[PDB]
Design a binder for this molecule. Structure first.
Ligand code: SAH
Length: 207
């Protein structure tokens, strides 16, 4: 509790957690429950903890930046690309106050089994849905989406996710450019795109 209270306050003064709604989600969400038992001690630390199969639980700053950028409001249909631990998915679920749905796709079958497991241990099942598949393809079974969060570094923006984005929809996609990856925000204006650039992020590449 105290480590969680200190973390989100530290984040607030840095100017990451601008929204109170985003902050409440961070405080509510136990990261300890998404990390593997050994990393429980370091769960509250603001760095990407290691996970099996190349996955890494995205740092609490990386998660607050993406939630902040998708403009969280209740009743959102959200597509999280690259579930991993599913920690980001629970944070988006609290940000929408459990009203709506978090659809989350994962290339690794093993990883999807672990994320879905943690999401049941806390009560996110139903609100959050896990799929074993391709992030580039996306979920056309439930599309269009209010927010799409790409928790992996694309070489180029997949066109299958811009089209799976509904009118007014936000997509926060790390794109691997020169001198590193740039966190990008994409805004859909009916038929027009708005590719806006934020900060230089460190993310695992997209398959
Ligand atoms: N093409 C692809 N489609 C779906 N998932 C992918 C992918 N390429 C990589 N991934 C997965 O995306 C994950 C990145 S880790 C993201 C962790 C997440 N923000 C959290 O806190 O839960 C890894 O599990 C990796 O296997």
């Amino acid at each position: 509790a105290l480590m969680a209270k200190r973390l989100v306050e530290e984040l607030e003064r840095d100017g990451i957690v601008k929204s109170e709604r985003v902050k409440r989600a961070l405080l509510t969400v136990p990261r300890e429950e998404f990390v593997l038992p050994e990393y429980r001690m370091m769960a509250y630390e603001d760095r990407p903890l290691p996970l099996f199969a190349g996955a890494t639980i995205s740092a609490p700053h990386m998660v607050a930046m993406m939630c902040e950028l998708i403009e969280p409001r209740p009743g959102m249909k959200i597509l999280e690309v690259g579930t991993g631990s599913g920690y980001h998915a629970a944070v988006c679920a609290e940000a929408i106050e459990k009203k709506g749905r978090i659809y989350t796709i994962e290339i690794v079958k093993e990883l999807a089994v672990f994320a879905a497991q943690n999401l049941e241990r806390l009560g996110y099942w139903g609100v959050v849905e896990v799929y074993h598949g391709d992030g580039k393809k996306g979920l056309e079974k439930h599309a269009p989406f209010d927010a799409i969060i790409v928790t992996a570094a694309a070489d180029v923006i997949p066109p299958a996710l811009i089209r799976q984005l509904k009118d007014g929809g936000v997509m926060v996609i790390p794109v691997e450019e020169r001198l590193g990856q740039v966190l990008y925000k994409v805004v859909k204006r009916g038929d027009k795109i708005e590719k806006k650039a934020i900060t230089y992020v460190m993310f695992v590449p997209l398959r």
